[PDB]
Design a protein around this ligand. Structure first.
Ligand SMILES: [Zn+2]
Ligand SMILES: [Zn+2]
Ligand SMILES: [Zn+2]
Ligand SMILES: [Zn+2]
Ligand SMILES: [Zn+2]
Ligand SMILES: [Zn+2]
Ligand SMILES: [Zn+2]
Ligand SMILES: [Zn+2]
Ligand SMILES: [Zn+2]
Ligand SMILES: [Zn+2]
Ligand SMILES: [Zn+2]
Ligand SMILES: [Zn+2]
Ligand SMILES: [Zn+2]
Ligand SMILES: [Zn+2]
Ligand SMILES: [Zn+2]
Ligand SMILES: [Zn+2]
Ligand SMILES: [Zn+2]
Ligand SMILES: [Zn+2]
Ligand SMILES: [Zn+2]
Ligand SMILES: [Zn+2]
Ligand SMILES: [Zn+2]
Ligand SMILES: [Zn+2]
Ligand SMILES: [Zn+2]
Ligand SMILES: [Zn+2]
Ligand SMILES: [Zn+2]
Ligand SMILES: [Zn+2]
Ligand SMILES: [Zn+2]
Ligand SMILES: [Zn+2]
Ligand SMILES: [Zn+2]
Ligand SMILES: [Zn+2]
Ligand SMILES: [Zn+2]
Lengths: 402, 401, 410
């Protein structure tokens, strides 16, 4: 039961839902069909539960990486935009909303890491990673540092690692090959070796986490930091004069940060598929549609070419998109769990000097496969719980038989 | 040993063993070689144990789906019938007795699901699934229901599911591809959606089992049911005027029921491999041979073209074969274990409404891998135990080092 | 830290380390670079532990089968010999030091099983397996047996099993295909059948192990035994007049023993990679180089063609190489643990009569998969433990960097 004759939308609380409701208000005045916008707690946890039974919203807004799991479960419907509508959004975004060859969601916003520099300390940010060590010595004389960013999470260190030919899984033929991992290749080796060399030459500290990195830049202690659009608001409050720009190149190659895409998916159980399509394609994914949402709570860089060109007058939003286009799209597959587990360990152990770069990255392959087994066990036993509960109910009972 | 100079045959207690003994008695009169026919308890469980050590029968008669496990273990011999003898049996039946490319048994009988209708209530049975919802309303005016069949086991519901393009595993070039599963495709999806649509529209009950469906047809409460030849004798006692016909077509395409094939395999440890070929090919697999078995206990439809055409004068035996030819053969691979587990839950959850058809069939892949892991865990520890004794017991201990 | 400017070598205690040190001394006299040769206890277990952290020796010497694991962990560097140097060694040996398509070590010495016969009892050794049952009946009349070897280990029985077309894994394009297992094909079946046929015809005993086999040949109770070079010293002491020859052919096909290659690998963490290449290629892998090592403790057959020709004037060393050249190199992959586990059981069960050849060899496929399961099972929990305790490592390090990060500046 989702109610035929109306649309119900689920979007997270930190987004411009009131602005989205104004698009749904515009939709009513034209079609006479009422659009409700709901923003429930942990909707990402709730959606798989309710949609499995045939309930939940008509449309759901979330990051694309979580949509891979929804489509695996058959909770999302295959969308049908034509060639001409597909030309409206940046071609690279459409690859993020693909599962099993077929398209499963509409890309809305684009999210990726950028290089954030202090304008007062550093008017000309470096274009290369290689010139940062020399730039640190020049700033250490003034009692400052060149660069401080989170080293604990692989998400932040990956841009450098992937610069030279490092990848999570090979994306070819619209499918991720899980037998083709680019974690201990030549380019990932050099990327991490540069990061470790930065640490043992005291240009960075191996223990630097998110808090330590943010607090440093916002006090004016460090000239540069690596962070996403979610951090801009806190830098605005610190009164620091900052700029957001393209990430530094390593061995002439651009940094490849992970790209997160906010996407709109249609519930497979929805009896209003065509209505949702009309809403999303012809009301929301238009200049006026995205503007209403952006004015409530900024979307950052958007998928729609026409509206992105208008936001890109903000040099920070242009930088987000530029880094995104040069970046790697976040894979939406289940194997991504084992990847994080292994690479998080790999970088920690190389940065501490516990393992060589060569041996820490080699260990990732065997460490991720090990984690896949725990997940493989996890699913097997929860299946048995269900099986026993299944029979326990019908077949032999305190008041039944077979 | 299995004794050279004679044949010993294993065949289940519910088959025409006396009739087979007669065929052995004909064999003894022509060749001077004594044939013994035995029927031990749980011979399907006993065969893998004794054949592994080199003992057991020369020939074993059983459903082909169990012969995969025997051939995998190397307990069966590669049979050598020539082209001329292979034209004597229906072409599709040979696919049932093929493991790893090699042929490993002789096809004897053919079992499959068929549509059984009540002639007095419904003289003209529906040819399409699509017209059953309309046919139910017409019968509900007389307090009766159109169709009731077992919905708990997938074996019964699969015919519909596979109708439009669903399949267990892909079968090309004589071998299954365990990576080409067709339980999540558009055809299997539409098939199961029709089954669920029937239940949500009150034409069928989601909790109808084998007992409930059989009893309803034999009392005359329902007009149609889906079942195999095994159930005919119970309908015969109920005095119900019944017929057996082709399964209804869904989306203009036939239902594809799974096909069981009673097969005769030769033991790998048998010193009488040549005598078994002579007996199975030139004595049993003839009109006269199968006649003798069929008169003791009916074989149903048979693999041999000549004797089948003779049996097809019984319209029930013609329909069993017709449904079998349109259907697919029950895969004899070990991945079938996990396949059943996943599809049984898929259908139950779709029928009860715990999962949408799409979501129910999607979870099938993840449940098949679950049963695989679970099933592979138990092969791991079984092995560890065996080793443990072997090293533990044979290799050294008090009285040794 | 491994020290740049000098070479440190790890070689097992039962090898000619003094002879190697003399090659190190020769290197020092020409180049002025000192070479230390260390022989630590259980170095094969220690090397992965220390080379992971960036320590350990510059060069390591060990059987090639263990090097695959070192390469998998990225502890070994890619060696760079040119075409002209690769012609110096036997082409087959280079396949033993290969992993992921890269070369990872220099082949030094070759080790393989051979047929060892008693000369006084049997001057003309049988060229075929098929004539051994007939030759046993002749010797039983004189109160002796024809052949006695270890039947408990698959390493010893495999030569016969592999002969007609049995293989652990298919080696093509320089890669090991783990999906193509030839343990229950027609050839391996026929081999094991002959072995089992020998036992139930009382020509061999199913309970015969390494100790029973060796002691029986050394006292002069059996005419032939199958064993490696490692056992020659014991037979020398027993005053038995013995020869080492090519293994008997089964169905006209040669017996295929597994080949062990003693190899020199360069540490990936070594700051002397170019120095180690100079040493190994131009000082050790020369007639004079291997001469010095061989005179300390014999190497057996060697990888270097030139020095092999000189050693082949020993009829025992020539036979070791002959058997090694007809046999297959032991796969350097992890899947080999499960293979030994399964084949060991297969043969034990077939020999005892517990299972038929067919049933035994078919059950090897499931027994190998079961062992593979156990291994990744114990690897997954080692992974969980390591991570689980890593959560603490962070907690403690949150109270360390917090201060120091302020001490220096603050
Ligand atoms: Zn709020
Ligand atoms: Zn809320
Ligand atoms: Zn939330
Ligand atoms: Zn520096
Ligand atoms: Zn404009
Ligand atoms: Zn008997
Ligand atoms: Zn079956
Ligand atoms: Zn013929
Ligand atoms: Zn053949
Ligand atoms: Zn209806
Ligand atoms: Zn169609
Ligand atoms: Zn075909
Ligand atoms: Zn075909
Ligand atoms: Zn296919
Ligand atoms: Zn006839
Ligand atoms: Zn006759
Ligand atoms: Zn007749
Ligand atoms: Zn067909
Ligand atoms: Zn160190
Ligand atoms: Zn000199
Ligand atoms: Zn010199
Ligand atoms: Zn020592
Ligand atoms: Zn070895
Ligand atoms: Zn080659
Ligand atoms: Zn004999
Ligand atoms: Zn012993
Ligand atoms: Zn020299
Ligand atoms: Zn010389
Ligand atoms: Zn060869
Ligand atoms: Zn804490
Ligand atoms: Zn610390």
């Amino acid at each position: 039961k989702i109610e035929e004759g109306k649309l119900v939308i689920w979007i997270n609380g930190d987004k411009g839902y009131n602005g989205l409701a104004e698009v749904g208000k515009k939709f009513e005045k034209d079609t006479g069909i009422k659009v409700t916008v709901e923003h429930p707690d942990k909707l990402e946890e709730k959606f798989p539960q309710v949609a499995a039974t045939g309930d939940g919203p008509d449309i759901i807004f979330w990051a694309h990486d979580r949509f891979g799991g929804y489509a695996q479960s058959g909770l999302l419907a295959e969308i049908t935009p034509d060639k001409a509508f597909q030309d409206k959004l940046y071609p690279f975004t459409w690859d993020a909303v693909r599962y099993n060859g077929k398209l499963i969601a509409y890309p809305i916003a684009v999210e990726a890491l950028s290089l954030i520099y202090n304008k007062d300390l550093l008017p000309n940010p470096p274009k290369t990673w290689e010139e940062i060590p020399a730039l640190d010595k020049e700033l250490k004389a003034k009692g400052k540092s060149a660069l401080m960013f989170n080293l604990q999470e692989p998400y932040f260190t990956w841009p450098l690692i992937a610069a030279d030919g490092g990848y999570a899984f090979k994306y070819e033929n619209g499918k991720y090959d899980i037998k083709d991992v680019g974690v201990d290749n030549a380019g990932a080796k050099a990327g991490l070796t540069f990061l470790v060399d930065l640490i043992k030459n005291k240009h960075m500290n191996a223990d630097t986490d998110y808090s330590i990195a943010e607090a440093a830049f916002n006090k004016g202690e460090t000239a540069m930091t690596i962070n996403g659009p979610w951090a801009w608001s806190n830098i605005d409050t610190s009164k620091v004069n900052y700029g957001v720009t393209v990430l530094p190149t390593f061995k002439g190659q651009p940094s490849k940060p992970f790209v997160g895409v906010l996407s709109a998916g249609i519930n497979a159980a929805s009896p209003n598929k065509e209505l949702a399509k009309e809403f999303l394609e012809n009301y929301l994914l238009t200049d006026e549609g995205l503007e209403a949402v952006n004015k409530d709570k900024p979307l950052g860089a958007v998928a729609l070419k026409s509206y992105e060109e208008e936001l890109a007058k903000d040099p920070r939003i242009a930088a987000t998109m530029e880094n995104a286009q040069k970046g790697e799209i976040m894979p939406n597959i289940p194997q991504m769990s084992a990847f994080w587990y292994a690479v998080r360990t790999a970088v920690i152990n190389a940065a501490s000097g516990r393992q060589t770069v060569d041996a820490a990255l080699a260990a990732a392959q065997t460490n991720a496969a090990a984690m896949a087994t725990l997940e493989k066990l996890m699913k097997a036993f929860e299946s048995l719980k269900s099986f026993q509960q299944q029979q326990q109910q019908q077949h032999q009972h305190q008041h039944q038989q077979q």
